[PDB]
PDB file of C-alpha atoms in Angstrom:
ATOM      1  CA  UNK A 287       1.173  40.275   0.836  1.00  0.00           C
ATOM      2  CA  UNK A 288      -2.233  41.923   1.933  1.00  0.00           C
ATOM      3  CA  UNK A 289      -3.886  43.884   4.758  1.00  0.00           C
ATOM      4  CA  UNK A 290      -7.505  42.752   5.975  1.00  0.00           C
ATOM      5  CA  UNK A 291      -9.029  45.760   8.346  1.00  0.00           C
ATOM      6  CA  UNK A 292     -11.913  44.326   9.653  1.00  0.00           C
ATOM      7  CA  UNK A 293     -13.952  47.051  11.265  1.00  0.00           C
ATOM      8  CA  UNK A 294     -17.162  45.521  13.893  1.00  0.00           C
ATOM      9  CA  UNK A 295     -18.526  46.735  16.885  1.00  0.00           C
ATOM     10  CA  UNK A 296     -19.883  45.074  19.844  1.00  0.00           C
ATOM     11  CA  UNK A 297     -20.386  44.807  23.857  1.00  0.00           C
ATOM     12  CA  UNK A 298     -16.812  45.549  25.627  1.00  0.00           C
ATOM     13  CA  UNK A 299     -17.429  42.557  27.787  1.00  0.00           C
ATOM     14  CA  UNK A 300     -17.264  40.044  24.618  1.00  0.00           C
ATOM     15  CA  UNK A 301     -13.038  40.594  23.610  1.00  0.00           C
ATOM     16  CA  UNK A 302     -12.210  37.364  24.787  1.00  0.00           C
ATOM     17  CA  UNK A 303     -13.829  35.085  21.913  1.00  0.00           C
ATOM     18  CA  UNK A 304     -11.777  37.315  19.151  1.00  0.00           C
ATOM     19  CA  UNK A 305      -8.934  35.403  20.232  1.00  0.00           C
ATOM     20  CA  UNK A 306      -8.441  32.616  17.508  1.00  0.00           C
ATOM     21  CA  UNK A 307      -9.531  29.257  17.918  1.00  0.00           C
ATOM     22  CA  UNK A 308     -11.738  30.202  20.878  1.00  0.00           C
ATOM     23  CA  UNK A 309     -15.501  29.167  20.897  1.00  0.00           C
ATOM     24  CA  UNK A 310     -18.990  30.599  22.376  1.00  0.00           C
ATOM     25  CA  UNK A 311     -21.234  32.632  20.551  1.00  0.00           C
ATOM     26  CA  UNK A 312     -19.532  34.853  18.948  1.00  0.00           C
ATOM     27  CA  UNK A 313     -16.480  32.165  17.307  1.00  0.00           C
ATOM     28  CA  UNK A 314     -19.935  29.736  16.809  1.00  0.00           C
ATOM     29  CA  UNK A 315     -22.322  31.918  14.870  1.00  0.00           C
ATOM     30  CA  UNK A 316     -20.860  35.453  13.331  1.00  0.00           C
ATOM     31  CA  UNK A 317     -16.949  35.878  13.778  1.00  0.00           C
ATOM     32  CA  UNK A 318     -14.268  33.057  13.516  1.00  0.00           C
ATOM     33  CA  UNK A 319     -11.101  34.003  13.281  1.00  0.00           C
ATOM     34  CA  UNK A 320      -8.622  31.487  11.910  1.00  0.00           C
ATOM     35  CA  UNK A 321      -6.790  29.126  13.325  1.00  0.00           C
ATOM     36  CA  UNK A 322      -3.135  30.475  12.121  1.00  0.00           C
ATOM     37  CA  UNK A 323      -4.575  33.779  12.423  1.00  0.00           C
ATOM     38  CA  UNK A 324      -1.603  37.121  11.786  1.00  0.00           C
ATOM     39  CA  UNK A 325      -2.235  40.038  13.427  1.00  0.00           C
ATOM     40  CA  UNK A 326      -2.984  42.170  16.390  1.00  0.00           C
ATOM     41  CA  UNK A 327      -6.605  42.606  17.579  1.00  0.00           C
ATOM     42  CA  UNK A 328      -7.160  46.218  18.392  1.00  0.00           C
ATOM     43  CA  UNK A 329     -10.156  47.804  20.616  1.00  0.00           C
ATOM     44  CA  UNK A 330     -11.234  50.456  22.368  1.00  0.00           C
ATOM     45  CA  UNK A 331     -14.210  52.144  24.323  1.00  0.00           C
ATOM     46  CA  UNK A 332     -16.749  53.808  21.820  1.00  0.00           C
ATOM     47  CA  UNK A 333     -19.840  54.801  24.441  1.00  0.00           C
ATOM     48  CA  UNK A 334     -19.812  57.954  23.818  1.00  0.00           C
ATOM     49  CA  UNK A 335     -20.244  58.084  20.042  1.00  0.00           C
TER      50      UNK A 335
ATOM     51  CA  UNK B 191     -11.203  15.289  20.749  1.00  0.00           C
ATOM     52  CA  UNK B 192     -14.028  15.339  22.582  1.00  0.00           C
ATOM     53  CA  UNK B 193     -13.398  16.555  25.882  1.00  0.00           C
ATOM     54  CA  UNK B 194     -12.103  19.935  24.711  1.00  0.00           C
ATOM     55  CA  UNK B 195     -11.975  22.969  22.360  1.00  0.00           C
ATOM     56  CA  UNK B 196      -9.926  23.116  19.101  1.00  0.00           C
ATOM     57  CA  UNK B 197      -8.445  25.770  20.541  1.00  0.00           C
ATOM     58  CA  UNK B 198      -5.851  24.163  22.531  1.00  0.00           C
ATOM     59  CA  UNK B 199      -7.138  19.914  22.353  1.00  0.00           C
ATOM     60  CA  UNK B 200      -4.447  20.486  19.466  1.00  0.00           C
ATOM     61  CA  UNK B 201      -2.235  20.829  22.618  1.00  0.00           C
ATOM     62  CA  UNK B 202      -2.485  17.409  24.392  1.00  0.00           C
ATOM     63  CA  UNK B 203      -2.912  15.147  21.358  1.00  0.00           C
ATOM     64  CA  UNK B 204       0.207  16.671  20.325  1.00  0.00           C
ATOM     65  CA  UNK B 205       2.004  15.367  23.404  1.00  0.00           C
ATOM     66  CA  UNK B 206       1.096  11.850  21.765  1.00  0.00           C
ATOM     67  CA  UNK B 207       2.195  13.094  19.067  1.00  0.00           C
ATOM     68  CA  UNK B 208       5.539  13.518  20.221  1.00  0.00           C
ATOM     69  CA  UNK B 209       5.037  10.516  22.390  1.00  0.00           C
ATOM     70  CA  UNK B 210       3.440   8.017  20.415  1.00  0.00           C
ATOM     71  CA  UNK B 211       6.058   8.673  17.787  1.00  0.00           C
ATOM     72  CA  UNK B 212       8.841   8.374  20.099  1.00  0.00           C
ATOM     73  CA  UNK B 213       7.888   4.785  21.352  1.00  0.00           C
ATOM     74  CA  UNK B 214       7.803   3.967  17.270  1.00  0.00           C
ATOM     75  CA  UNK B 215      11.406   5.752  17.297  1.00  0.00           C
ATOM     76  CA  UNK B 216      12.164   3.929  19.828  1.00  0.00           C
ATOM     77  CA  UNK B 217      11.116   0.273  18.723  1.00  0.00           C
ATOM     78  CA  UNK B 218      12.634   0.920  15.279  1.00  0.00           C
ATOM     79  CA  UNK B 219      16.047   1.515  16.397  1.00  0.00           C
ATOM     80  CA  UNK B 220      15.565  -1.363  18.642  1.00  0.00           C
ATOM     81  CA  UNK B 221      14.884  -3.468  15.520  1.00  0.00           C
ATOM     82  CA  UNK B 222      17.796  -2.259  13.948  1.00  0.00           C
ATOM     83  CA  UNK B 223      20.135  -3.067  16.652  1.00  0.00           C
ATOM     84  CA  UNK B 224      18.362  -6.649  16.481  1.00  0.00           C
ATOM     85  CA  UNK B 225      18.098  -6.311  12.418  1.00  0.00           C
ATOM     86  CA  UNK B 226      21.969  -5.936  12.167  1.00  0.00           C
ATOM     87  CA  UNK B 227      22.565  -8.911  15.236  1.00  0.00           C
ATOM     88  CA  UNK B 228      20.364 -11.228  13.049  1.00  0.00           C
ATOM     89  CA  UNK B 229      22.580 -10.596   9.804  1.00  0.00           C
ATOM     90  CA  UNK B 230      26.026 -11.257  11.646  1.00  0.00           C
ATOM     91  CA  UNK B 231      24.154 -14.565  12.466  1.00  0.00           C
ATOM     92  CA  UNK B 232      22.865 -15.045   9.321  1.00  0.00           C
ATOM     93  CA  UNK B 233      26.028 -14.029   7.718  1.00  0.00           C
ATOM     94  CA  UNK B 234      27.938 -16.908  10.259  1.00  0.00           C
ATOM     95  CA  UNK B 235      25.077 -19.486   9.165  1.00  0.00           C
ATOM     96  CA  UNK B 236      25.619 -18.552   5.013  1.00  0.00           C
ATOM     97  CA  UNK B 237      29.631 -20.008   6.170  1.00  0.00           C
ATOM     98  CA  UNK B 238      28.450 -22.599   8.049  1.00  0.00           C
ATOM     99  CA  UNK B 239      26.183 -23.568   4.932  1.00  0.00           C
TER     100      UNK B 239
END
């Protein structure tokens, strides 16, 4: 029906709480991803720029 | 609820779920078995009225 591209960057070590329903800081305070959430989650190493 | 995460406490309580129900499943079809014994008595009593 519709495509959301949600474009964020953070710390490679913090992944895990983009997966829906988890919790910590990041599903508490500035990113919760849905419950019935549809999709793939997509990242990669950006150091360098 | 309160021992764990909405991420998968959705998990257990739906074992109840399935449980719980199961039991009522259960004791309903019981009562029906019972429900339809009472009737062929009843039905035998309306006679013997």
């Amino acid at each position: 029906t519709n495509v959301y591209a949600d474009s964020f960057v953070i710390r490679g070590d913090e992944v895990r709480q983009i997966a829906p329903g988890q919790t910590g800081k990041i599903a508490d305070y500035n990113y919760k991803l849905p419950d019935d959430f549809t999709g793939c989650v997509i990242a990669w190493n950006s150091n360098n720029l | 609820l309160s021992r764990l995460d909405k991420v998968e406490a959705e998990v257990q309580i739906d074992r109840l779920i399935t449980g719980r129900l199961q039991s009522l499943q259960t004791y309903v079809t019981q009562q029906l078995i019972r429900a339809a014994e009472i009737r062929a008595s009843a039905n035998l009593a309306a006679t013997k009225m």
